[PDB]
Design a binder for this molecule. Structure first.
Ligand SMILES: Nc1nc2c(ncn2[C@@H]2O[C@H](COP(=O)(O)OP(=O)(O)OP(=O)(O)O)[C@@H](O)[C@H]2O)c(=O)[nH]1
Ligand SMILES: Nc1nc2c(ncn2[C@@H]2O[C@H](COP(=O)(O)OP(=O)(O)OP(=O)(O)O)[C@@H](O)[C@H]2O)c(=O)[nH]1
Ligand SMILES: Nc1nc2c(ncn2[C@@H]2O[C@H](COP(=O)(O)OP(=O)(O)O)[C@@H](O)[C@H]2O)c(=O)[nH]1
Ligand SMILES: Nc1nc2c(ncn2[C@@H]2O[C@H](COP(=O)(O)OP(=O)(O)O)[C@@H](O)[C@H]2O)c(=O)[nH]1
Ligand SMILES: [Mg+2]
Ligand SMILES: [Mg+2]
Lengths: 439, 430, 53, 27, 50, 431, 430
C-alpha cells in the first residue's frame, strides 16, 4: 500500500545499492534465496515487506529494484554470487560498451538505446504497485554513465509520471581527494539536469565518510564495502517510518514539504549517530541527550561542508529505538540555547521530529555495534553553497584553455552546452546568497 | 564483449609478441596444447577477450603474425607455446625489407598487405563487439617501421571509432645497432601521430639499466628484456579481464590521459622489481610500491621525468587493498612534489584498483604517465637526422623507389612541429 | 625468479614458524584491512549479543 | 573483494528467529 | 544491449551471451536426476538388480 | 548529584593519578575491571547503565610511554579508552614547546573531552588538576588548559595540586626557568593551589615510616590519602560537612593570596603504631609540628592566616574544640592580628582506608590540615635567586626563544613574582 | 615511535657499528638471522626504534654502511651478525680516499654522495615520526672525516628540526697511527662544530688505559674497545626503549646539557667496570657506582676532568632502585666536590632512571659530562696543526684537489675561537 521503487544506475549506485539490499533482507528476515525461512505460518505481519518487496503468490519475495549499467563486470558479479536467486533476471539490464567517464557517450550516443528498455521495466514495476510513494535513485555524478544515463532517466520519468516525488542519493567528488581527472566537467553538466528534475538531493561525498571511519569506528584502512554500509543504514532509518509503527510517523511525502522552502533549494546533507565500534561502544549508556549532540558535531557531517559557515534553514530528526518523546523535547531546547548553532531569521521553528519503535539492525561480519537508539539527520543549510563554488573554480581552470573538450564535441554534444551549465550553477549561487541574508 | 585483436610485425615485434602470449597463457592457465587447466573460475570468465573457441574446445589466440621474411616466423613457431597460433594466420613475404622504409612501405609492403588485410578483416568481423587493436613493432627496422605503420593507416581508415594502441620501441643513441635508424624513425613518427590513438615508447637502454642496477642480474639477454615489456603489456588490460573495485577499460584510459589530440605518447613502468637475493628484506605495502613507481630509474624510457612536468598520470593497482590508502598516497606525492606537476589541472593522477594480482605476486602496479620530458628523445633523434640528411647520406636507397626528398622535408618539419607545441605547455602558466 | 615469488611451477614458498608472543604482539599492533583493530579489552566474559543502552 | 565481503558474509542463521515490533478491605 | 545468439559461442562458463539460461537449463538437467534417484525409477539400478 | 572532574597532565600527574585512582577504587569497592561485586560513588564515577563504572578522569601526555603503561596495565579496562590522550613528540623540559608549538595541536581534543564529560554532569562542583611544574609539558599544557577553561566556564572553581622543586634536591637544570613562567599563568587562573615539594615528603617517609630507600610510588600514596581525606566530605556522611565551594570562602583573604600548603597526621608504620593510643589530642598537635609539613617550608618564620582541619573517624566535637584552645594558647604558633578566629573544622565518620601492599598503618582517627601562611613567601624568594643567577648570563635562553617565545616574556614573569612577594610582605605586617 | 636511523662511515665507523648492532640485537633477543627468540614481553614494545619489519617476521636494522674501499664491508658481511643488514643499504666506491680529506670531501665524496643521500632520504621518509640521526666515524682518516661531515652538512640542510648524534674518535698524539692527522682533524672539527647537535669525543689512548688498568686484562684489542664504545652507546639511549621512573630522550639531554649553542662536545664513560678476578669481591651499590662514575681514570677521553670545572653533567641509571638514593648521592657529590663545579649555575647534574638493567648485571650507569677540560685536546691538536702548517708540509697534496690555504687558516681560526670562548666560562664568575 506504500511502495518505493529504487533505481540503481552506474557502478557507484550498484555497489552502494548492493549493501542496501543486504541490509533490508536482514531487517525483514528474508533469506538471500528469497523464501521466507518459516513457510506461511500465522506469525507474519503483512504490509511490512510490501514497501520494498513484492509477493510472488506462493513463497519468495521479489525486490522492487532495477539494476542499470552499460558495463557487464559489476552486474555479472551479482548474477554469479549468492544473490543470483533473489533478483528478477530481466531486471538486471546490462550493456556492452562502457561510457568511460564521458558524459556525451552516456547521454547522446549509448544512452538512447538503453533508456527504452529501462522505462519499459519501470512501467511493469509500477503497475504491480498500487500506493507508489516515490522513486529512489543512486548514482555517482563524477562518472560517465552515472551522470549520462542518470540525467536521461530523470528527464523521462518527470514526464511519464509527473507529480511522483523523486529522491536522489548522489555522490559528489571530494574537495581534493578524487579518482578521475575530468570529473569536474561532467559533474557540472549533471548538476543542471537534476536541479530541475529532482525534489530532494542528498550530499554523499567520499572524503567525509573516510574521516568518520578514522575517528569514530577507528578504521585506518577502509575499503568501499565499509562505506556502503554507512549509507545503507541512513536509507533504512529514513524509510523505517513506512513499515514500522511509532509515536510520530512521517511519510515520504511529508519530507520535501518540510525541508524545501523554495523550489530551487533542495540540496541538503545527511548525518547519522551513533557510529561507534563494538570495542568502545560498550562503556557508554548512549543517552538520547548525547547522541543528538553528536549529530550536530560538524565533523560528523557526511558531506565535506562546514555548517558553521552558514545558517540553518530547517533540520529533520528521525529517532528509532526506545526514545521517550519528552527526552527529545528537552534535548532540542538545549540545542537552540547553544550559541555555535544559528538558524535563519525567517524560520523561527525549524525542527521536524519522528520516532520509531524498531531499533537498528546489525549485519553479521560488519563493523558497527548494534544499540538501542539511533538518530538520522537531514538538514538544509546555506553552508552548502561552498561545495558548488569550489567545483566551479576547478571547472574554470580547465575550460579556460579547452582541455579534454574534443572528447565531448566528437560525440554529438555542441560546444556551447558547457557555457549554459555555467550560468545555472552561477544562478544557483546567487539564490543561496539571496536567501541567506536577513530581513 | 569488448575484445581486442593483436597484430605483431617485424623481428623486434615478433619477439615481444612471442613472450607476451606466454605470460597471458600462464595467467589464464592455458597449456601449450591449447587445453585449459586453470584453478579458479575467474581464470575463464573473460577468456573471450584474447582467445577464440574452436572444435574440440581448445583455444587459439587471435593474433596475426605479419612480416617480410619467413626466417623469424620459423623460430617463433618452434618455441614453446608456439602451437597455439593459427597456422593460417602466418602471412609472410619472401624478399625482405632490408631496413629500407621505402621497401617496407611502397614496393614490397604494399603488394603483400592486401592478403594480411583479409585475415585481419576476418578476425574483426567475427568478434561480438570489437574494442580496439594493439600493435607491437620497432621504429628502427624497415619492415617493423614501414609496413608496420602502413597497416595502421589502412585499419584506421576502415575502423574509425575504435582504439589504436602501439607498443613502440624507439632507438636510443647509446645502444644503436643500425646506421640508418634516424631516417626510418622520423618517417614513422610522422605517420604514427596522425592515426595512433595511444602509443607507448620503450628504450633498449632503459631496459638494460633496469636489469643491471635494480634486478642486479649479471647477464641480461633479449629474453629478459622481452619479459619486462610483456608484464607491463598485460597490466594495461589487466582490469579488462578481472573484477575490481574501480573497473577501467582502454577507452577510459584514453579519455583521462590525452588532453589535446596530438599529444598521445606515453612512458610506462612496472612495480615491484626486486632482486633474487633481496626479496626477503623488502615489505610489500602500498607506500612501498608508490616510492618505486615514481622512481626515475624505474621508467622503461630513457627520458628523465624530472626534466619536465607531468601533464597527466595513471596508476593501476592489482591485489586486495584499501581504497583510502591508495587515495591518500596519490594526494601526498602530488603535494610533496608540486614542482613536477602542471598546475592548471587539479588532481592530475588517476587511480584504479583490481582484485587479481599477477601470478606469484601479492601486489603489482603498472604506471602510465604523460610527461613533457618525452621531447628529449625527439630532439636527439632529429639532431641525428638533420646532420645525416644535410649531406644526403644513404639517400639514394630511399630515392630509388619513387619516394622523393619532398617527403623527407615534410617529416622533419612535422617532427619539430610536434616538439614545439609539446614544449610550450611546460612553460604555459595559468 | 625476480617476478615470481610464489608459483615456481612446483615449489610453494614456505610455511614459516617463529615464536607465539611475536604473533600476539603483531595482532595487537597490526592495522588490519576491514575490521578496525583490537583495543585490548577482550575480557571474554562479556555476553555476546547483550547490547548496552 | 565482493566475494569475500558480501557474498559469503551471511549464513543460514541470522534468519531463523526474526521478530520485529508488532502493531482495600480495611473494615 | 546484451545481444544473444551471437554466431560462434563458447561454453556457459564464459559470459559472452545467453550463458545464464544455458546454465539454468544444465542445472535443471541435474535437477531431474536427483528426483529420479529419490524415487527408485533409475534405469541404472534396475540393471544391477537384474 | 554532586560531581568533580580530575585532570592529569604530565608524567607526575599521571603517576600520582594511578595511585589516587587505585585508592578510590579500593575505597568504593569497585574492581579493577570496573565491575562492582555483589550511590556515594557518584562523586567520582559514572554508571554505564548495567554493571561497570567509568571514572571522571582524563589523562594527558605527549610521550606515549606512561600512557601505554596504563593502556596495558591491570587498569586497562577501567578508563574510557579514548580519553587517554597521547602525543608523538615530548616537550623535553621546554616550556615553550608545551605552550606554543606542539600543545596547540593537542589542546583541542582535551577541551572537547572535558566538554563531553561536563555535559554528563549535573552538579559540577569544580575541577581538580595535578601537574608537575618543573617540567615542559606539565607547565606548558597546564597553563594552556587553565587559560582555556577560564574563558570556557567562568565561575567553576579549580583546585590545583602542583609539585614545585625542592630547595636543593632536583633533577633538571633548567627548571628555575619554567617554574617561574607557569606560576605567572596559574596565579590568575587557579582558585586554590597546594605546595607539594618532593624533599619534604622524603623526610616524612623516613622519620615516621622507617623507610630507608623511598621511591616515587611511596610519595604518590601519601598524596592520594590527602586527596581522599579532602574529598570524603562530599561522598560520606558526617556531623559537620564541608564542600569545595566551602574552601575558597574560608582560606583566601584576598584574591591573589591563594597559594597554600598541606599536612597530614598521623603518619606512622604498623610496627610501632600499636604501642600508643593515637588520641585526638596529640594527632592534632602533630599536624602543626613543622617537621611534619608536606612542603619544605618553615611555618615558624611567619604568621598564620587561616587553617582548615578535616577530621575523619570517630572524633567527638567536644574533644576537637578542647584541642583547638590548646593550639591557640600555645606561644610558638602565631596568627595574624586581623584574624581572631582562624579555624574552620569539618568532621566525617568514614575511617581512613588502607591499601594492601602499602607501608602505612591504619588508625581510628586522621586529620588533614590545609593552612595559608605568610611563610610561603620564602619558597618564592629562593626560587627567584636561582633564576636571577642564570638569567644574568642568559643560559639556555636560546632554547626557549627558537620555539616561538618572545624574549620579553621572561622579564614580565620575573616582575609579577616580585609583586607577589611585596604583597605578602605588606599583608603580613600588623595595623 | 620517535625512532632514529643509524649511519656508519669509514673503517672505524663500520667496526664500531658491527659491535653496536650485535649488542642491540643481543639486548632485544634477536638472532643473527633476524628472528625473535626472546622471553620477555617488554623486548617487543619499543623494538621499532632501531628495526624495521619485513615479510616472514624478520627484523632488519635501519643502518647505512658507506666507504670508498669495499674491503671493510666485505669483511663485515661474512662476519657474525652480518646477514642482518640489507644489501641495498651497502654503498661503496672503487678508488678509496687514501687518508685525504680533500679527496674524500671534494672529489670522490661529491660524486658518491648522491646514492647515500637517496638511501638516507628513503629511510627517513619511511619512518612514522623521526627523532634524529646518530653517526659513528673517525676524524683522523680521509673518507670518514670527509664524507661523514659532508653528509652531516647535507642532512642538517634537509632536516633542520631533527636532532643529530655523533660519536667521534679523535686522534691522540700519544698513540698516533697517521702522520697527517692534525690537518684533517682540524678540517673536520671546523665543519662539525657548526652542524652537529651532540658530539662525544673518544680517544684510543683512553680506551687502552681503561682496558690495561681498570679491567686489568692481558691483551686488549679492537674487539674490546668496540665493546666498550657500544655499551656506552646503548646505555645512552636505553631510556628511549624501556620504561622507567623518569623518561629522558635525546632532546631532553641536549636541553639540559648545552647552555650555549657552540658548546656541545661531551665526554662519556661507563660503570661499573672491574677486573674479572675481583668480580665476586665487589659490592654494587649506588655510592660505589657514582664514585667509579666520577673517577677521573674512568673517562673515555684523554682530558683530565679535574683540570677544569664541569658545566653540566647527566647520569642515566639502569635497574630497579630508589630515586631518593640517587638524588642524595648526586647532591653529596656536588657538595663534596664544589670546587670542580661552576658556580653561576645551580644544581648542574641531571638524573634519569630506567628499570631494565643490562643482561647479566643488576645495575649500570652511563655518565655524560660537558666539562671545560676538553680544551686540552683542541689545544694540542691545533699546536700540531700549526707546527706542520708553518712549513707547508704535505700541503700541495691537499691543495691539488681544489682547496687553498685560506680554508686552512679559517679552520685554525675557528678552532682557536672555540678554545678561547670555551675556556672563558671557566674564568667567568658571578
Ligand atoms: N562511495 C562510493 N563511491 C564510489 C564507489 N565506486 C565508485 N565511486 C565513485 O564513482 C566515481 C567514478 O564513477 P564510477 O562509479 O567509478 O563509474 P560510473 O559512475 O559507473 O561511470 P563509468 O566509469 O563510465 O562506468 C569515483 O570518483 C568514486 O568516487 C563506491 O563503491 N562507493
Ligand atoms: N611526586 C612525584 N613527582 C614526580 C614523579 N615523577 C616525576 N615527578 C616530578 O616531575 C618533575 C619533572 O617533570 P617530568 O617527570 O619530566 O614530567 P613533565 O613535567 O610532564 O615534563 P616532561 O618530561 O617533558 O614530560 C620532577 O622534578 C619530579 O619532581 C612522581 O612519580 N611523583
Ligand atoms: N626489446 C627487444 N628489442 C629488440 C629485439 N630484437 C631486436 N630488437 C631491437 O630492434 C632493433 C632492430 O630492429 P629490426 O630487427 O631491424 O626490426 P625489423 O626490421 O622490423 O625486423 C635493434 O636496435 C634492437 O635493439 C628483442 O628481442 N627485444
Ligand atoms: N675503536 C676503534 N678504533 C679503530 C678501529 N679501527 C681503526 N680504528 C682507529 O682509526 C684510526 C684510523 O682511521 P682510518 O682508517 O684512517 O679512518 P678512515 O680513513 O675513515 O677509514 C686509527 O688511529 C685507529 O686507532 C676499531 O675497530 N675500533
Ligand atoms: Mg563503470
Ligand atoms: Mg616526559
Amino acid at each position: 500500500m506504500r511502495e518505493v521503487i529504487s533505481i540503481h544506475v552506474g557502478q557507484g549506485g550498484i555497489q552502494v545499492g548492493n549493501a542496501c539490499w543486504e541490509l533490508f533482507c536482514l531487517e525483514h528476515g528474508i533469506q538471500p534465496d528469497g523464501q521466507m525461512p518459516s513457510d506461511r505460518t500465522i506469525g507474519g505481519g503483512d504490509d511490512a515487506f510490501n514497501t520494498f518487496f513484492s509477493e510472488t503468490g506462493a513463497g519468495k519475495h521479489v525486490p522492487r529494484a532495477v539494476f542499470l549499467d552499460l558495463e557487464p563486470t559489476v552486474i555479472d558479479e551479482v548474477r554469479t554470487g549468492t544473490y543470483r536467486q533473489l533478483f528478477h533476471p530481466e531486471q538486471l539490464i546490462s550493456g556492452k560498451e562502457d561510457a568511460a567517464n564521458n558524459f556525451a557517450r552516456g547521454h547522446y550516443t549509448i544512452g538512447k538505446e538503453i533508456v527504452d528498455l529501462c522505462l519499459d521495466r519501470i512501467r511493469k514495476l509500477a503497475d504491480n504497485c498500487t500506493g507508489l510513494q516515490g522513486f529512489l535513485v543512486f548514482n555517482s555524478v563524477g562518472g560517465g554513465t552515472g551522470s549520462g544515463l542518470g540525467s536521461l532517466l530523470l528527464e523521462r520519468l518527470s514526464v511519464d509520471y509527473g507529480k511522483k516525488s523523486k529522491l536522489g542519493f548522489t555522490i559528489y567528488p571530494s574537495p581534493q581527494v578524487s579518482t578521475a581527472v575530468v570529473e569536474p566537467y561532467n559533474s557540472i553538466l549533471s548538476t543542471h539536469s537534476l536541479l530541475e528534475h529532482t525534489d530532494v538531493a542528498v550530499m554523499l561525498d567520499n572524503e567525509a565518510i573516510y574521516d568518520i571511519c578514522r575517528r569514530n569506528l577507528d578504521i585506518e584502512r577502509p575499503t568501499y564495502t565499509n562505506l556502503n554500509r554507512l549509507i545503507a543504514q541512513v536509507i533504512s532509518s529514513l524509510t523505517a517510518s513506512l513499515r514500522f509503527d511509532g509515536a510520530l510517523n512521517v511519510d515520504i511525502t511529508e519530507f520535501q514539504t518540510n525541508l524545501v522552502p523554495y523550489p530551487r533549494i533542495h540540496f541538503m546533507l545527511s548525518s547519522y549517530a551513533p557510529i561507534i565500534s563494538a570495542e568502545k561502544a560498550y562503556h557508554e549508556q548512549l543517552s538520547v541527550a548525547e547522541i543528538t549532540n553528536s549529530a550536530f558535531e560538524p565533523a560528523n557531517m557526511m558531506a565535506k561542508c562546514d555548517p558553521r559557515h552558514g545558517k540553518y534553514m530547517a533540520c529533520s530528526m528521525m529517532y528509532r529505538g526506545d526514545v521517550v518523546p519528552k527526552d527529545v523535547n528537552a534535548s532540542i531546547a538545549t540545542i537552540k540555547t547553544k550559541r555555535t548553532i544559528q538558524f535563519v531569521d525567517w524560520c523561527p521553528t525549524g525542527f521536524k521530529v519522528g520516532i520509531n519503535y524498531q531499533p537498528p539492525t546489525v549485519v553479521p561480519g560488519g563493523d558497527l555495534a548494534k544499540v538501542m537508539r539511533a538518530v538520522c539527520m537531514i538538514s538544509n543549510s546555506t553552508a552548502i553553497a561552498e561545495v558548488f563554488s569550489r567545483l566551479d573554480h576547478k571547472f574554470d581552470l580547465m575550460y579556460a584553455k579547452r582541455a579534454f573538450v574534443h572528447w565531448y564535441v566528437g560525440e554529438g554534444m555542441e560546444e556551447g552546452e558547457f557555457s549554459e551549465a555555467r550560468e545555472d550553477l552561477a544562478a544557483l549561487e546567487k539564490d543561496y546568497e539571496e536567501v541567506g541574508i536577513e530581513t | 564483449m569488448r575484445e581486442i585483436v593483436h597484430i605483431q610485425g617485424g623481428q623486434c615485434g615478433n619477439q615481444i609478441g612471442a613472450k607476451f602470449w606466454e605470460v597471458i597463457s600462464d595467467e589464464h592457465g592455458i597449456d601449450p596444447t591449447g587445453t585449459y587447466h586453470g584453478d579458479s573460475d575467474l581464470q575463464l570468465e573473460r577468456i573471450n577477450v584474447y582467445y577464440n573457441e574452436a572444435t574440440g574446445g581448445r583455444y587459439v589466440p587471435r593474433a596475426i603474425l605479419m612480416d617480410l621474411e619467413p626466417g623469424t616466423m620459423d623460430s617463433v613457431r618452434a618455441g614453446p607455446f608456439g602451437q597455439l597460433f593459427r597456422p593460417d594466420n602466418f602471412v609472410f613475404g619472401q624478399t625482405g625489407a632490408g631496413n629500407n622504409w621505402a621497401k617496407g612501405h611502397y614496393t614490397e609492403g604494399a603488394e603483400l598487405i592486401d592478403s594480411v588485410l583479409d585475415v585481419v578483416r576476418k578476425e574483426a568481423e567475427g568478434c561480438d563487439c570489437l574494442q580496439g587493436f594493439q600493435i607491437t613493432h620497432s621504429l628502427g627496422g624497415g619492415t617493423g617501421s614501414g609496413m608496420g605503420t602502413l597497416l595502421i593507416s589502412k585499419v584506421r581508415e576502415e575502423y574509425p571509432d575504435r582504439i589504436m594502441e602501439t607498443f613502440s620501441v624507439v632507438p636510443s643513441p647509446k645502444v644503436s645497432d643500425t646506421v640508418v635508424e634516424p631516417y626510418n624513425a622520423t618517417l614513422s613518427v610522422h605517420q604514427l601521430v596522425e592515426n595512433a590513438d595511444e602509443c607507448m615508447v620503450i628504450d633498449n637502454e632503459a631496459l638494460y639499466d633496469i636489469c643491471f642496477r635494480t634486478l642486479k642480474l649479471t647477464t641480461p639477454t633479449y629474453g629478459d628484456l622481452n619479459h619486462l615489456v610483456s608484464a607491463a603489456m598485460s597490466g594495461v588490460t589487466c582490469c579488462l579481464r578481472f573484477p575490481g573495485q574501480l573497473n577501467s577499460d582502454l577507452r577510459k584510459l584514453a579519455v583521462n590521459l590525452i588532453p589535446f589530440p596530438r599529444l598521445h605518447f606515453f612512458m610506462i613502468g612496472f612495480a615491484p622489481l626486486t632482486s633474487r637475493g633481496s626479496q626477503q628484506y623488502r615489505a610489500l605495502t602500498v607506500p612501498e610500491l608508490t616510492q618505486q613507481m615514481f622512481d626515475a630509474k624505474n621508467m622503461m624510457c630513457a627520458a628523465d621525468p624530472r626534466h619536465g612536468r607531468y601533464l597527466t598520470a595513471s596508476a593501476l593497482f592489482r591485489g586486495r587493498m584499501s581504497t583510502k590508502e591508495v587515495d591518500e598516497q596519490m594526494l601526498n606525492v602530488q603535494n610533496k612534489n608540486s614542482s613536477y606537476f602542471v598546475e592548471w589541472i587539479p588532481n592530475n593522477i588517476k587511480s584504479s584498483i583490481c582484485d587479481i594480482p599477477p601470478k606469484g605476486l601479492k601486489m603489482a602496479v603498472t604506471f602510465v604517465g604523460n610527461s613533457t620530458a618525452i621531447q628529449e628523445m625527439f630532439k636527439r633523434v632529429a639532431e641525428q637526422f638533420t646532420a645525416m640528411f644535410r649531406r644526403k647520406a644513404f639517400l639514394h636507397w630511399y630515392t630509388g623507389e619513387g619516394m622523393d626528398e619532398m617527403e623527407f622535408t615534410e617529416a622533419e618539419s612535422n617532427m619539430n612541429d610536434l616538439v614545439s607545441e609539446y614544449q610550450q605547455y611546460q612553460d604555459a602558466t595559468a | 625468479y625476480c617476478l615470481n615469488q610464489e608459483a615456481l611451477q612446483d615449489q610453494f614458498p614456505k610455511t614459516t614458524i617463529v615464536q607465539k608472543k611475536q604473533e600476539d604482539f603483531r595482532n595487537f599492533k597490526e592495522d588490519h584491512l576491514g575490521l578496525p583493530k583490537n583495543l585490548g579489552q577482550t575480557n571474554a566474559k562479556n555476553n555476546p549479543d547483550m547490547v548496552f543502552g | 573483494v565482493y566475494k569475500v565481503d558480501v557474498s559469503n558474509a551471511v549464513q543460514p542463521k541470522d534468519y531463523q528467529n526474526h521478530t520485529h515490533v508488532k502493531k482495600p478491605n480495611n473494615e | 544491449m546484451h545481444n544473444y545468439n551471437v554466431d560462434r559461442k563458447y561454453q556457459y562458463n564464459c559470459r559472452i551471451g545467453n550463458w545464464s539460461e544455458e546454465w539454468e537449463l544444465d542445472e535443471y538437467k541435474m535437477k531431474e536426476y536427483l528426483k529420479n534417484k529419490e524415487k527408485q525409477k533409475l534405469v541404472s539400478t534396475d540393471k544391477e538388480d537384474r
